[PDB]
Assembly symmetry: D2
Homo-oligomer: 281 residues x 4
């Protein structure tokens, strides 16, 4: 298959932008209607073919792991059925969630997974960014596509998308080439919240990466970006243009918008919710 | 001020919101950026309650933690924020926790040792009384308590429904009730179009009645309620403004939007975004 | 007539340093004396004395203490025999455990003050959990906490348990104006100190108190040290000042499980006495 | 270098033999003087060269992980010698990973759950309620460390054993009647659970330490007609040579009350700072 077996997901220490909702519950457990962000993120991983998920965590984060694990008393009450099928249907049996503690920096959270991952290519996924399942085919596009491409060329993939205001993100330098959703083109560097006038593209790092086993040593020499730009010095790495829509639930308004969008699409209450929104707005 | 303690049963596990509540308490689901329990407690405080008793479960330390101070967190934030965050539980308010050993009537019983034989407020936490459609410091719980204190008559909040077939309606021997008013209730029929909302202000007299009080072998507070009734004058208080049942998925999704539009820093942008998108 | 001391308050919010690393991720109060955590002995002592309301003044990382006394669902499941019933009986049905968080408040005086809202303006017992009162060496249903409560009901005077120490240079020693105390006796104390030539007595403060409702306002008005620190000894000195305080002479033996050596000595002493393994252990001990 | 890089520690089951102490704290967190049993076991894995430990766990046991992680609030609270001691707990080059076991299904099944973590590689299996005495063997040269070096040389799995008086209480190996000296590895032709003394192939009991080849993986994947480690070991013997390794020094079974109380006293006598005193104390008192 693919040498990309593991997805490393850094679990937020404290999602301060979302206080106080996340003062005592992880932001990864904040819900989009009726499921926690991390359940969408894990299913995205799985749709791409990943079966091993390495959560890079902290002490106050047990509920994320319990969400995917079995909940004895809960299930007991449940028998005491659909929901029951559902709660045990959260993590497919062929999927394994692993945990390692980080006790700062995303590049640091990645390095922490080194020992679990080995000296192999890996996927890095940020948990507060949700790629829209209805807007693209997760089994074929995006992370799924970035991995197929990595297998084909051995070139790291870095998901990106066009954004209005560039100063707010980390922009990639694709030497001015235009990219269509779905394509991969070489990147020659990354610019941390560039100043509009000097920004390399309008292409923002989305929070999805498929990286060659070489970042590992680079991470040690080294944030992800600097080992990224160092990797770039050694090999080709490409920007992959995200297909569909993403939701950034790491910012309050982004989260509120996602809440509503997923609300309108809810399998059982979406139409009624949508109707209500229309007679209400 | 005779009523200083509010009992909040939050020890049940919340089914209708699965899978979101599998590993987190339903009481910590956010309405925008504040958990349901924060709105609830804020409501108690506004009414002058200074001691909140959570009748809980092993899995809900997140709720107490939300109200306690998060050291490492505090170690982290900033000036503006750092305030807002300690500020969750003001200094004169105490959150106490007792573990339940099922039913609301039994949940309230467990708090007896903490409350003592005193008048007590009973608050259902997955029901939100809208802070913008009422003045929570002057109305509803605030006032139902102010009236208990003035007259020692118990108060049970109710609001008019549509399908009275769908609900339990209090019997007020036919007296027309309007927002803001109270009038004796003689019981409930499952007589008026008024339903129990989930806020109760009860005389210390319910305790012994609650001890002497089931459907699934659960202790019903309705049962002690009617008992208190045959012993005394209990009044229905007509809720003012709007309530939000956040214990049902749709009701929760709808309050999320209503509150978002009213959000103090993001309400205007979200509302405009919504208006276009929708 | 029933006493008015209805609640015991147990400060369990601190992170116990002298016991590290053992207590690095577990409460010092959950350290076992053979096969039971220190806290169960302490709660049982409250119970033997008739207290049925216990207030733990805790911290976030200590949910295990409450879990100890609650029903342990999965465990009982996987338990369904003796263990089931032993385990099922750890906290009797008529005993209620309440918890309140100490939060930012530093100091023992603060810890006690935190329970005020649960206790009310009522007298209360204050129990430090790392000191274990030997259930074999005295009758906890009549002595010690049980007797200090009775003395407080008979005189209105707050009670402070003390015990005799050969070395006064290492303790909180009381001044009872040189009046002698025999076990079980309470006599007014006018202060608390001590070098040795100037010590007012050989009686050290053990860790148990039965205080009147008057400690409440005093505690709230106790002047802080930095960071709000309110010490209970300070509040105690003002109580002594406001009124009559007696020192009560402990019966039996105490185990200070707050220090390493003492927790070890305790573990051994309770092992030898274990209802099931006492004999075999004691013997194995004589052999070794 | 060795292909044996990972040690799997099954700590997921709930320890009934030690109730009620263990009602709400994991058995692995009980202290032998001033350290939890799991610290001793982790330190032993480290002495043997292991720098990757996989706990196969349960939800109610975060405390085991917190023990090795950074105790931010404590550290802060200490910020001297003790602060160091405290951080030093897990050496920076050693990593603890965790996986949850599904339905409580046995040690065999516990190891099996570590498969995705370890991969198709040889592993060390360590039962954490058995403590190998540090004072009585050189844990950096004998026992697990030796077992691992013999596996690297030969490629033969190593199952640790020690002589017992009563075989009916253990899983016993069959080495074809051949004597093993401490530190010696001898091929085993079978394993048997709790034999009646009259048919027992030896008086050498499985202690609880294993260094297994990557070939036990497919064997552990099989469902019996309860997945048992010894049954897997017996299937492996069928395919390949497996040796029993005779433990050096002394072991402590702290999975049973008496054994834990004895180990607590034995280690208190040896405590670095308090032993002399504690011992003296015990003499006068005994």
């Amino acid at each position: 298959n693919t040498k990309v077996k593991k997805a490393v997901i850094p679990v937020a220490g404290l999602g301060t932008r979302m206080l106080p909702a996340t003062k005592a519950i992880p932001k990864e457990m904040l819900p989009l209607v009726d499921k926690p962000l991390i359940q969408y993120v894990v299913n995205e991983c799985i749709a791409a073919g990943i079966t091993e998920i390495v959560l890079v965590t902290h002490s106050s984060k047990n509920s994320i792991e319990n969400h995917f694990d079995t909940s004895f008393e809960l299930e007991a009450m449940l028998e005491k059925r659909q929901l029951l099928d559902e709660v045990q249907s959260i993590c497919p049996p062929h999927v394994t969630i692993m945990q390692v503690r980080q006790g700062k920096g995303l590049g640091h959270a990645v390095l922490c997974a080194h020992p679990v991952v080995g000296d192999e290519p890996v996927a890095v996924i940020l948990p507060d960014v949700i790629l829209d399942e209805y807007e693209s085919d997760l089994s074929q596009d995006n992370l799924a596509e970035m991995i197929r491409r990595f297998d084909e060329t051995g070139h790291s993939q870095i998901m990106v998308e066009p954004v209005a205001d560039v100063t707010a993100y980390g922009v990639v330098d694709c030497k001015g080439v235009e990219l269509a959703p779905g394509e991969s083109v070489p990147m020659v560097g990354v610019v941390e919240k560039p100043k509009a006038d000097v920004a390399p593209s309008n292409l923002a790092i989305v929070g999805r990466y498929v990286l060659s086993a070489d970042i590992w040593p680079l991470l040690a020499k080294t944030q992800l970006t600097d080992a990224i730009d160092m990797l770039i010095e050694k090999e080709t790495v490409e920007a992959y243009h995200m297909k569909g829509k993403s939701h950034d639930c790491g910012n309050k308004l982004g989260y509120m918008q996602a809440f509503v969008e997923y609300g309108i699409r809810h399998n059982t209450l979406g139409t009624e919710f949508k109707a209500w929104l229309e007679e209400e707005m």
